[PDB]
């Protein structure tokens with residue numbers, strides 16, 4: 412048997428942890444034990460950028476990651492990180508599972524990966540330790556951690572946020588020590604990382620959709636037999652099913668869960684106010700990634 416490694420930045424008991432555990436189980440079953448996959452949680456093999464870099468270098472075979480750091484490797488994916496592009500999870504999933512998403516997986520080939528499938532981190536929401544956020548003006552002047560994503564950083568600077576990019580494993584301590592006022596993430600991540608302990612304010616801004624991607628080292632993938640290549644592809648699809656189911660459960664439980672953990676949660680956000688604030692920066696995104704490409708995603712089924 413060949414034993415490979417896969418890593419994530421969140422816990423085993425999270426949407427991403429159930430994803431990689433399912434993937435690992437399915438690889439072993441479908442390859443008849445020829446391959447086994449050791450799982451690493453909570454940044455044990457580094458944050459997402461470090462893990463993807465390792466996969467590209469070949470020091471590690473696999474990673475499951477949000478798209479946060481992905482444009483640094485594959486710039487064609489940026490269009491997915493545009494705020495308020497996707498209406499809801501059903502829209503995003505349909506887009507990513509259909510030809511638009513499937514074509515984007517192919518762009519990873521030239522950068523030394525096989526991208527096995529798309530998965531899901533979820534819609535991201537603002538938290539902070541200073542004040543309730545009801546409109547964009549409330550974001551102005553907040554120091555917020557961001558991922559290492561240029562679309563997110565430009566967008567949030569558009570809200571007047573003072574941005575600080577950081578790898579995920581450093582975020583709890585930064586919030587704890589007040590190095591930043593806040594951050595933004597899906598409810599799955601806020602709950603699994605226990606950010607309720609260090610943030611008292613949450614607003615369901617849902618300001619961007621955060622995909623996850625399964626990446627494998629291209630050379631490692633290419634040396635698999637044809638049948639085993641298919642086993643890895645199918646194991647990733649099963650991992651995605653588990654992943655998405657967990658996101659749906661976490662989004663359903665999340666507001667109540669966090670209220671019980673002491674957060675003040677603002678659950679009825681008027682997103683149009685935030686769209687209006689972003690209009691100038693959004694115009695630039697549309698010009699960079701192409702209005703035709705944006706509208707194709709918007710109008711997809």
Ligand SMILES: O=C(O)[C@H](O)[C@H](O)CO
Nearest residue numbers: 420477479532558579596
């Ligand atoms: O905030 C982040 O960096 C990501 O959402 C997290 O690592 C899970 O993918």
